[PDB]
């Protein structure tokens, strides 16, 4: 595992040498290939190195980050085009990636938290540094302060577990089952925030709408998963307490998913709409996760991988349109099929994946969470039908409205799509399908 870490560390100096922007991604893509060869993992931890291991769960999430963090560099070519502190920008991602790799590769719960939040600050610099609109302040704080407010109490819950278990290592924790009501709320309300839950999602539409394209990728790509990944490790020893209060979370997320889907239909901003679509699906992920069944756990792991690639993908396309039309509102963006017809194909495939269209990896995960939820209670069929219905209602509205109609009138002349953009879109979607072939690996982490 140290092979990855020391590779990244020695790539830090590449931020300082000039005319090395493009030589960075290749080193970032090549390491993904090298990491892609060392899959021999199992449910239990493997490749121990001083505190760094990796199981099938951590592997897929790590590999997802390397892929996504590599696409960030492709997407944010404008930073290179205007030399807008590109060297500092590169160092932000290389640091950020290292924090993620450690976070998932950490074997002890305290470490996971140590790099859990620490990744936030590199993200926070990203929003303020390279965001256009003035609201990146008022969205910079929300991201920082919702997270800190609920992560600091989690730190107490972590330490209280040493004095009982005597250690942080995940395997040793699973041997215990705790009965204290507050402790349950000090290790899940901290992750329920970052999922996010419907009622505490108020930061998500602000952070995503204002953050740059690259920040949108990682915020939607890996930050929403750290909440999901964290839960998968800490419901193991909260099984008893999970049964007394699960019905509160399931109802909120399920009803939260439906209500947000209606909110999606009344949006008029591409960035906002995609961001609210994240809350909709993340409600199903959390819902199935708390069902605790074998299906709900394997499925939740799957959907987190698939959704991140998609929602990250859809943020590419919004940036492409915004870069030229200059406005992210739906009213400006119309009939793009008649300006950039080649682009509209990628709009569809990424859009179709978001609505659980086949043969994507997204449908495999969504079939499963749906199974666990139904088994949990037949009453869940009511909204789970509504949520899947409306989860396509806004996706069509997102795609159709922005691509189909007659062209805008005031738009000034702008460049057409470039090869970089097409290559970026392929790398987002094409794995999202081929992964179905080897779901063997990225599914059975239990």
Partner 1 sequence: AGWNKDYKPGPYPQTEKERLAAAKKYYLLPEEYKPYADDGLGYGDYPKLGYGLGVEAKDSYYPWDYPEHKRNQHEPISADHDLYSEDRWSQAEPPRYSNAYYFACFLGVMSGCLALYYWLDDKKMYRPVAAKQYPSPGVKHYTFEK
Partner 2 sequence: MKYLSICSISFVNLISMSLSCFLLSLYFLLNDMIYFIEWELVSLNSMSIVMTFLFDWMSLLFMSFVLMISSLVIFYSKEYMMNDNHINRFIMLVLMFVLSMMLLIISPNLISILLGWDGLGLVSYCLVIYFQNIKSYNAGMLTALSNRIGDVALLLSIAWMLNYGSWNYIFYLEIMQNEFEMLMIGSLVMLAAMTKSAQIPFSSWLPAAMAAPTPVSALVHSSTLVTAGVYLLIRFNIILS
Partner 3 sequence: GHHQMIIKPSRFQWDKFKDLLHFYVMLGVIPVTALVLYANIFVGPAQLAEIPEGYEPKHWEYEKHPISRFISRYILNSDQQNYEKSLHYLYEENEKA
Ligand X SMILES: CCCCCCCCCCCCCCCCCC(=O)OC[C@H](COP(=O)([O-])OCC(O)COP(=O)([O-])OC[C@@H](COC(=O)CCCCCCCCCCCCCCCCC)OC(=O)CCCCCCCCCCCCCCCCC)OC(=O)CCCCCCCCCCCCCCCCC
Ligand Y SMILES: CCCCCCCCCCCCCCCCCC(=O)OC[C@H](COP(=O)([O-])OCC[N+](C)(C)C)OC(=O)CCCCCCCCCCCCCCCCC
Residues in the site for ligand 3PE, rule: CB under 6 A? 16, 87-88, 91, 265, 385-386, 389, 393, 397
The distance of Cα 372 from the centroid of its chain, to the nearest Å, equals 22
Among 52, 274, 340, 384, binds partner 3 (CB under 8 A): 340
Site for ligand X in 337-376 (CB under 6 A): 337, 341-342, 344-345, 348-349
Q: What's the Cα-to-Cα distance from 19 to each of 76, 86, 90, 118, 129, rounded to whole Å?
A: 15, 10, 12, 29, 21
CA-closest candidate to residue 43, choices 31, 32, 21, 58? 58
Instruction: Rule CB under 8 A: say whether 133 interacts with partner 3.
Output: no
Which of ligand X, ligand 3PE, partner 1, none interacts with 345 (beta carbon under 5 to 8 A by kind)? Answer: ligand X
CA-closest candidate to residue 86, choices 10, 5, 6, 22? 22
CB-CB contact of 91 with 15 (8 Å): yes
Helix ranges, 106-238 (H): 109-118, 120-130, 136-165, 170-173, 181-185, 189-194, 204-210, 213-218, 224-234
In terms of CB distance, is 266 or 420 closer to partner 1?
Answer: 266
- Shortest distance (Å) from residue 189 CB to partner 3: 27
CA-closest candidate to residue 52, choices 88, 6, 86? 6
- Shortest distance (Å) from residue 161 CB to ligand Y: 42
Which of ligand 3PE, partner 1, ligand Y, none interacts with 436 (beta carbon under 5 to 8 A by kind)? Answer: ligand Y
- Shortest distance (Å) from residue 435 CB to ligand X: 14
CA-closest candidate to residue 177, choices 131, 243, 113? 243
Site for partner 3 in 258-317 (CB under 8 A): none
**Assigned token pair, 162:** 């040493």
In terms of CB distance, is 334 or 428 closer to partner 1?
Answer: 334
Of the candidate spans 121-129, 161-169, 186-194, 437-445, the one that interacts with partner 3 by CB under 8 A turns out to be 161-169
Instruction: Give the C-alpha separation, 253 to 259, whole Å.
Output: 10
Instruction: Rule CB under 8 A: say whether 371 interacts with partner 2.
Output: yes
Among 266, 418, 420, 438, binds partner 1 (CB under 8 A): 266
The residue count for binding ligand X (CB under 6 A) is 8
- Shortest distance (Å) from residue 15 CB to ligand 3PE: 6
**Assigned token pair, 345:** 């194909």
- Shortest distance (Å) from residue 406 CB to partner 1: 5
Find tokens 């990728």 and name the residue. 217
CA-closest candidate to residue 117, choices 147, 139, 142? 147
Q: What's the Cα-to-Cα distance from 85 to each of 77, 96, 217, rounded to whole Å?
A: 12, 17, 19
In terms of CB distance, is 392 or 436 closer to ligand Y?
Answer: 436
Which of partner 1, ligand 3PE, ligand X, none interacts with 331 (beta carbon under 5 to 8 A by kind)? Answer: partner 1
Residues binding partner 1 (CB under 8 A)? 133-135, 266-268, 331, 334-335, 401, 405-410
Residues binding partner 3 (CB under 8 A)? 37-38, 40, 42, 44-48, 53, 165-167, 169, 171-172, 338-342, 416-419, 422-423, 426
């Amino acid at each position: 595992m140290l092979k990855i870490i020391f590779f990244l560390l020695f790539l830090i100096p590449f931020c300082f040498i000039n005319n090395m922007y493009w030589m960075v991604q290749i080193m970032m893509f090549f390491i993904s290939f090298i990491f892609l060869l060392m899959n021999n993992f199992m449910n239990y931890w493997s490749e121990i190195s001083y505190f760094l291991g990796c199981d099938m769960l951590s592997y897929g999430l790590i590999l997802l980050s390397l892929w996504i963090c590599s696409l960030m560099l492709l997407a944010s070519e404008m930073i290179n085009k205007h030399n807008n502190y590109k060297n500092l920008f590169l160092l932000n991602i290389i640091i950020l990636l290292l924090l993620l790799i450690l976070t998932f590769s950490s074997m002890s719960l305290f470490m996971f938290y140590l790099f859990f939040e620490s990744s936030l600050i590199p993200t926070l610099f990203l929003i303020l540094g390279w965001g256009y609109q003035p609201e990146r302040l008022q969205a910079g704080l929300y991201l920082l302060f919702y997270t800190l407010l609920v992560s600091l109490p989690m730190l107490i819950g972590i330490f209280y577990l040493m004095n009982k278990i005597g250690s942080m290592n995940f395997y040793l924790m699973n041997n215990f089952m705790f009965n204290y009501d507050l402790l349950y709320f000090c290790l899940l309300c901290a992750f329920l925030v970052k999922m996010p839950m419907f009622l505490v999602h108020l930061w998500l539409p602000k952070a995503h709408v204002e953050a740059p394209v690259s920040g949108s990728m990682i915020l939607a790509g890996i930050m929403l998963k750290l909440g999901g990944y964290g839960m998968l490790r800490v419901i193991s020893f909260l099984q008893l307490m999970n049964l007394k209060y699960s019905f509160v979370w399931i109802s909120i997320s399920l009803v939260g998913g439906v209500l947000v889907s209606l909110v999606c239909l009344r949006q008029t901003d591409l960035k906002a709409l995609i961001a609210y679509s994240s809350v909709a699906h993340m409600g199903i992920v959390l819902s199935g996760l708390l069902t605790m069944t074998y299906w709900g756990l394997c499925g939740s792991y799957t959907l987190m991988i698939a959704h991140g690639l998609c929602s990250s993908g859809l943020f590419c396309l919004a940036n492409v349109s915004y870069e030229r039309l200059g406005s992210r509102s739906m009213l400006i963006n119309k009939g793009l099929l008649n300006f950039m017809p080649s682009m509209t194909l990628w709009w569809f495939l990424l859009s179709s994946a978001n609505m659980a269209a086949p043969p994507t990896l997204n449908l495999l995960g969504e079939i499963y969470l749906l199974n666990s939820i139904v088994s949990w209670s037949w009453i869940s069929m009511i909204l789970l039908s509504f949520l899947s219905f409306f989860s396509a209602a806004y996706t069509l509205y997102l795609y159709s409205f922005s691509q189909h109609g007659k062209l805008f009138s005031g738009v000034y002349s702008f460049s057409s799509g470039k090869i970089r953009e097409y290559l970026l879109m392929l790398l987002h979607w094409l794995p999202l399908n081929l992964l179905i072939l080897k779901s063997e690996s990225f599914m059975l982490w239990l």
